[PDB]
Amino acid sequence: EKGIYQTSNFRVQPTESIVRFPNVTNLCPFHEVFNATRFASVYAWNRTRISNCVADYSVLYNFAPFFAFKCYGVSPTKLNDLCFTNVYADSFVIKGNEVSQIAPGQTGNIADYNYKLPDDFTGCVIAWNSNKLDSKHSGNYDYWYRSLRKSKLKPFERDISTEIYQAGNKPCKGKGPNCYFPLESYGFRPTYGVGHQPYRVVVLSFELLHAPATVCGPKKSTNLVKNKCVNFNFNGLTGTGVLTKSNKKFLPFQQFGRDIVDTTDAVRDPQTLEILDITPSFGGVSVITPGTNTSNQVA
Amino acid sequence: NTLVKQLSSKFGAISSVLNDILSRLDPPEAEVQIDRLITGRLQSLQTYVT
């Protein structure tokens, strides 16, 4: 019929994709953490920091086939694209039976006694069977497990002092019927079943805070283009918009900017540190039709 | 203002920014998070229209 009808919505598509990251030529030593000369225990695990480097995770793929490679809060294939503010690495060696217990929100003896992950865990868990690498017939004493703990552990809590757990209220020392010896450190021979076979295991704990510190993956920086609709990726902040010169007096501390509503409205270039305003053209579309019984022309 | 500000809410999702969800996760879990967000935003729009 004759009239004006709103039908669809128009938008102006981007013509280029821009990615900007700081010039960091270092490489993160994940494969050195995983390939430890001597391995820490689940009882006492090696927390090591990884920072100010390029988080290249293909080195892991080339470095081994893996018994397990599971990422809970992040996709296993997309690590090389993201930017991780505070990537921690927790390395140890563990029995196979308990490898399934390294997962958030799960219940199990090793979760209660030795090492637990939070319910709100963002990260990855990686495991490679260690029989063909370190395990001697005499047995390695890298393994160490808390047979019994007085109280359950919090996420990422460590407790090292060995003290005997008492059956009752009276103190016990060395008398088996009333003494629960806190540890079962034991070197295991390659011939044991799979449930006891060792596994070198590394847990990567990623905290995502839009990268104040970067340690960003191996993305390739491209030239900054302004006054055009583009798909921008500034230091992990992805979006689509027009980047223009900013007249806002940021402090040197601040990076991201925001409007009265929480929409990002300004950013800092990771390389040149220039403040750029992000302007979103989009709108409705109305078709003005005289009516098809009169004419097929339309505005 | 309230309608625009409801976008910053998570409604239980890991993040309120859809681009973060699509950049971090594979489809079969990004769908769960995006469905949580869709439910929240649909509720906001229905309230605004009413």
């Binding site: 009265i260 929409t263 989009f282 | 625009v4």
Partner: peptide
């Protein structure tokens, strides 16, 4: 006299109450 042909009272009324969609735009027009 004025560019808008409005009475003085209309000018007072219009002054008292207060194409880029700078504010609130997340599909809202």
């Amino acid at each position: 006299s004025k560019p808008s042909k409005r009475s003085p009272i209309e000018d007072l009324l219009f002054n008292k109450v207060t194409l880029i969609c700078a504010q609130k735009f997340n599909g809202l027009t």
